[PDB]
Structures are given as C-alpha cells and as structure tokens.
Structure 1
Amino acid sequence: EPSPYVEFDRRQWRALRMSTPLALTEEELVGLRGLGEQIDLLEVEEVYLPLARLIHLQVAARQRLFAATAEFLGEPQQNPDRPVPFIIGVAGSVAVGKSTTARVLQALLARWDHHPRVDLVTTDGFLYPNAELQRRNLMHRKGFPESYNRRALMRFVTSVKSGSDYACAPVYSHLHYDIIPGAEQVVRHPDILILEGLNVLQTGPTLMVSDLFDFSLYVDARIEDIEQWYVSRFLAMRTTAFADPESHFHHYAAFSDSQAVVAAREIWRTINRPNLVENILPTRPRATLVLRKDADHSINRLRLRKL
C-alpha cells in the first residue's frame, strides 16, 4: 500500500549527507545543547547534515513556487536580496529537545556559503502574561493552545513572510516564568525563519502559522521516555536554574530527589502529558520530517513526508 511517507534508520539517512560540510566544532555544538541533551558531532553528521541538505534543495525549489504567483500577477520580479523568507517549524513535547534541534539547525543553515540571515523564534514569548493567564484561569494550562496570543503569533509570522523590513515578538523569561515587560525580539527580513514551539504544527478554523511553514520538523520520542527526561531534568535544575534566588521555582531547589520526583510527575501528569496527547501528538502526521529519538536521546529513525 502506497504512503505519503518514507522512513529511514540512521544508516539509510546518513548516506544522504553526501558532501554537505560540517562547519561546526564540538565546542560550538556544546553551547547549543540544552541540559540533558546528548547531541554530539557524529549525530550532527549522520542526521543534521542530510537534513541541512534537503532543506537547501527545497529553499531554491520553494521559491520557483512564489515566483510563479508573482509572474502570474504580472509583478516586478526578484530583488534576489529580499526573496520570500523560508519558514521552518519545529514542534514537539516539552523536554524533547526542540530547542537543541532548532539552535543546531540555525547554526548549520547560517553557516552555509550564502551566509543567510537565519533567525530563530520560540512561541514562548507569545504566551499571555501570567496576570492575563490568571484572568482567564489558565495558569495551569500554560502550553495549551489557548494560553498563547495566537492572533499576535500569526500576525508576526505573516509579517515576516510577507516581506516586512522588521517584526517584533514579545520575550519570555524562563527565570521569572513570565513575559518580560518591554522586552522585544526584532526580526529583520531574514532569509530563513525558524519558529520553535509545542503547538506550531496545529491547524484550525482560521488560517494559522502551520499554514505558512515551507518545511517542518517534529522531534519525537516515547512518551514514557519524555516524562523521564522531564523528571530527570527537573531534579537536575535544582542546582542550575532553580538554584537562583530570583527563580520563580527557587523553592524546588531544596526538595529531595524523592520529593522533586513527586513534584515533577504531578506537573507532567496534570499539564505536559495531557497537552502532548491532546494537542501536540495529533499534529505529528503533518510534519515534513519526524525525528524519532530513543530513550538515550539519540535520533535513529526518521519519517519523511514526500507527499
């Protein structure tokens, strides 16, 4: 039976790397991975390099596509130095490694000879402020579709892909657990934009951001494995993030392995798991490429969307 997909194991996937060059040191790579992520240069070669290639083969191809509409409408032509921004989306559960994958990807893509302006934006900054969240009674739904100002989010990406000179996005603080007053991230007509978020790939009664993606990634892994990464990281943060007195979570630093595990699991059980099951996972089918990571965080399976 025919399928819209094609799957590989790392062995099959790596052979598609070809000549793509590795332009990242093992040290640069470090400042790119988040706590708990195992990414090393090898994985960047057998997995991220082919991927970088695929994306580059499509950037050109995807443009012939907008050219047509421009030609059809009988408009000016190029401005080879201001084409239509290539939008890439990275989706996946909390603690699955999206940020690592997105930062690495941005590092690889920016380090290509064109030296493209590759901007990265997370939907974090599009959550509603805690005050506003409390108003709607959503302080325990942070991450669910309704906890984001999607109108703003959509306005943003649309602006960037429609060729605006610059666009602004609010900024979220993981330290204070809230939106930073007056903080803004300005994006100036990038060549490529990477939007990272749990709910980037979702669809709805209104034109959404997933409808503006030219390529998409879904970082996947077993649910019990992700809970594990989540709990584990929670305990680990007792001495890194939580250790800071300014942290909205400083009280967890004192917890014992045992209590921390109990706490980490309750949050996972009442917030992140339900959201992953009800909102995130149902979007996985639409991702151009799904990266299957096993229990050790290693990506060794991939599902590509050819149709």
Structure 2
Amino acid sequence: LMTPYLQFNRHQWAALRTLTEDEITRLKGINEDLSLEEVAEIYLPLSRLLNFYISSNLRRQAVLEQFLGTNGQRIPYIISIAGSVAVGKSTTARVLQALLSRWPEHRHVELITTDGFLHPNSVLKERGLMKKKGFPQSYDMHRLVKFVSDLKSGVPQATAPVYSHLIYDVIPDGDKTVAQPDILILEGLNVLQSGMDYPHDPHHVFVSDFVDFSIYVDAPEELLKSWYINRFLKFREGAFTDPDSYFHNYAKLSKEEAVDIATSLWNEINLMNLKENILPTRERASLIMTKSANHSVNQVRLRK
C-alpha cells in the first residue's frame, strides 16, 4: 500500500499554485510545441518546489558555516534529469533553467548534457560500439563522475566535453567551461546509473553521490517510440540542405522508409537501452515526473 513517494495527480499538482513577455518568448524559444498552460500548471510549481529544496540547503550552509567556522566555499546545487531517449529530458532541463533563473538567490544556472561525455567515434569504432551510443560502455563515465566531483569540491572552473548532432560525434575542441554556478542542471540518460552498470570499468562513487536532487522523466514505451520517431523525422527534415550533416544520410530515404529505419533503431538500440539500463534506475530519483499523450504531465511522485 505505502511507497517511498508522495503521489500527485495532475490536478493536485496544478492546485499547488504568471510570467513576463520576455519569459514567454524564451519559453517558446525552447520548444514551439511547449504548451504555456503546461508551463503554468506543471513547471512553475516544480520550479517552486526545487527553490524550496535549494533555499533549505542555502540556509543549512549558513548554519553550518557558523558552527564549523569555515570560510564557506561556494558549492553549486546540482539537479540531475534522467529518462529515456526522447522522453523530454532536454526540454525539461531548459524550462527549469529558465524558471529557476527568476529568483535573485540563484541566478547563475548552468545546464550540461551528459551526451558530451560519450567516447568519440574513433574510440567507439575501435571498441565496436558505434551502434551502442547511449549504452554504459559508450560513456567516458569516470570523466563524468570527475566533473561533478570537481564541482562538489569547489573548483573555480570545470570543463565539459560537448556533443554535436550535426557531426554525430564529440566536438574535437568544443569543451565548455563551467565556473561555479549557483545551480547546475545535469541532464542525460545515465545520471542515476552507478558502478553496477559499468562492470567492464567499475567506478565506486556515483554521479548521484554528487547530485542534490534528481528527476526521472517517465512515459510509457509506446509514447516514447512515437516521440522518438517524430524527432527522427524532424532531424531528417532539418538536414535536407546540409550535405555534411549526419542526418543528411536519411534524406535519401523516402519518409516511409525513414519511419521504418527509425522504428528499427528504436526497437534494437533505444528500447533495449531503456529496459536494460535506464528504466531500472527510475526509483533512485528524488522525483518521478510521468507524461502522457501530447507530453501532458499526468503524475508527479516526490520522495517522502
């Protein structure tokens, strides 16, 4: 009967409760399909919830700084966002970055995707892993752990590698420098994974050990597949006139064969990755946000 999570249906979550014209523009800049009603009813209360957790942490830090007699190194609050390929992790992260910025206390909000920490294609091909991107063996997981550990050590700056969907590879010299933000949002399919998922090269302190609050964005596998295919088709269209783009390869296929191939890539790669590696980490999240048709949130679960 009882679980470790408080449960809110959509109506209960919306009942927890407006924006500037330049905030609306920024939100529409993130995604043209993003419903402003959804932002108002779901994401605004979520940003408020997160601010309570962040504020409580800042308060505690002052209390402990007084007790411990420390100079008080500035340490970022880190929020991680996990879930299937195509569930909406990136959209959620960008909306939360925009909304969390509104508070004076924590105005510098960085967003880092774990995509960048994939091994480059040259390494993957050597290892026979070109069709296993997003699987644990495809990640430089020690480097990702070191990244969040460095932030949680108070280093003045840390560098993250960045991934390109144009070249479908790590950007050779495109490393992003992060300089002690108030908040870092760390978004990627593997942020709740741990040593057990990396038996080929074990690590013993986990990403989650350096994350303050984690969100798992959830949806049934039939919706994920349809959102995956929709995106695939959008990437194909966006590459029509860029011959040097990875997705330009799919421009040569009819839309119908493109759907067939995307469906195969879902079934053989991404659905496998979901079932074997991503979905089992769900109950490690501070909060599970569940989506239904049209990306409407229908359930929020928060750890008691």
Q: TM-score, normalised by structure 2?
A: 0.91
The Cα offsets for residues 176-222 of structure 1, whole Å up to 9 and x where unpaired, read as: 00111111101000000000000111122611111211111111111
Give me the whole-angstrom Cα distance separating, in 1, the residues matched to 2:236 and 2:161.
27
Secondary structure of the residue that 2:173 maps to in structure 1? strand
Runs of 4+, deviation exceeding 4 Å: 64-72
Asked whether the 8 Å contact 1:26–1:40 carries over to 2, the reply is: no
Identical residues among aligned pairs (%) = 53
Flag the 1:104–1:136 CA change in 2: closer, same or farther, 3 A. same
Aligned partner (choices 18, 22, 46) of residue 19 of structure 2: 22
Residue identity opposite 2:258 in structure 1 = A
- Match for residue 295 of structure 1? 293
Give me the whole-angstrom Cα distance separating, in 2, the residues matched to 1:60 and 1:26.
25
Asked whether the 8 Å contact 2:5–2:301 carries over to 1, the reply is: yes
Give me the whole-angstrom Cα distance separating, in 2, the residues matched to 1:56 and 1:214.
12
Give ranges in structure 1 of 5+ residues lacking alignment.
none
- Match for residue 198 of structure 2? none
After TM superposition, the structure 1 = structure 2 runs for residues 242-257 of structure 1, keeping only pairs within 5 Å, are: 243-257=241-255
- Match for residue 261 of structure 1? 259
**1:76 positional shift:** 1.5
- Match for residue 131 of structure 2? 140
Residue identity opposite 2:219 in structure 1 = A
**1:53 positional shift:** 1.0
Asked whether the 8 Å contact 1:85–1:189 carries over to 2, the reply is: yes
After TM superposition, the structure 1 = structure 2 runs for residues 277-292 of structure 1, keeping only pairs within 5 Å, are: 277-292=275-290
Give me the whole-angstrom Cα distance separating, in 1, the residues matched to 2:217 and 2:88.
7
Say what the alpha-carbon RMSD is for the aligned residues: 1.9
Give me the whole-angstrom Cα distance separating, in 2, the residues matched to 1:276 and 1:299.
20
Residue identity opposite 1:283 in structure 2 = T
Give me the whole-angstrom Cα distance separating, in 2, the residues matched to 1:155 and 1:265.
36
After TM superposition, the structure 1 = structure 2 runs for residues 92-241 of structure 1, keeping only pairs within 5 Å, are: 92-114=83-105, 116-204=107-195, 206-241=204-239
After TM superposition, the structure 1 = structure 2 runs for residues 81-100 of structure 1, keeping only pairs within 5 Å, are: 83-100=74-91
Aligned partner (choices 53, 62, 66) of residue 58 of structure 1: 53
Give me the whole-angstrom Cα distance separating, in 2, the residues matched to 1:167 and 1:236.
33
**1:302 positional shift:** 1.1
Give me the whole-angstrom Cα distance separating, in 2, the residues matched to 1:40 and 1:244.
30
Q: TM-score, normalised by structure 1?
A: 0.90
Secondary structure of the residue that 1:31 maps to in structure 2? helix
Give me the whole-angstrom Cα distance separating, in 2, the residues matched to 1:8 and 1:161.
32
Asked whether the 8 Å contact 1:66–1:84 carries over to 2, the reply is: no
Flag the 1:115–1:192 CA change in 2: closer, same or farther, 3 A. closer
Asked whether the 8 Å contact 2:77–2:182 carries over to 1, the reply is: yes
**1:243 positional shift:** 4.2
The Cα offsets for residues 229-252 of structure 1, whole Å up to 9 and x where unpaired, read as: 111222232221454211122121
**1:296 positional shift:** 1.5
Give me the whole-angstrom Cα distance separating, in 2, the residues matched to 1:4 and 1:118.
29
Give me the whole-angstrom Cα distance separating, in 2, the residues matched to 1:279 and 1:128.
18
Residue identity opposite 1:44 in structure 2 = V
Residue 4 in structure 1 maps to residue 1 in structure 2: no
Give me the whole-angstrom Cα distance separating, in 2, the residues matched to 1:104 and 1:143.
23
Give me the whole-angstrom Cα distance separating, in 1, the residues matched to 2:205 and 2:60.
20
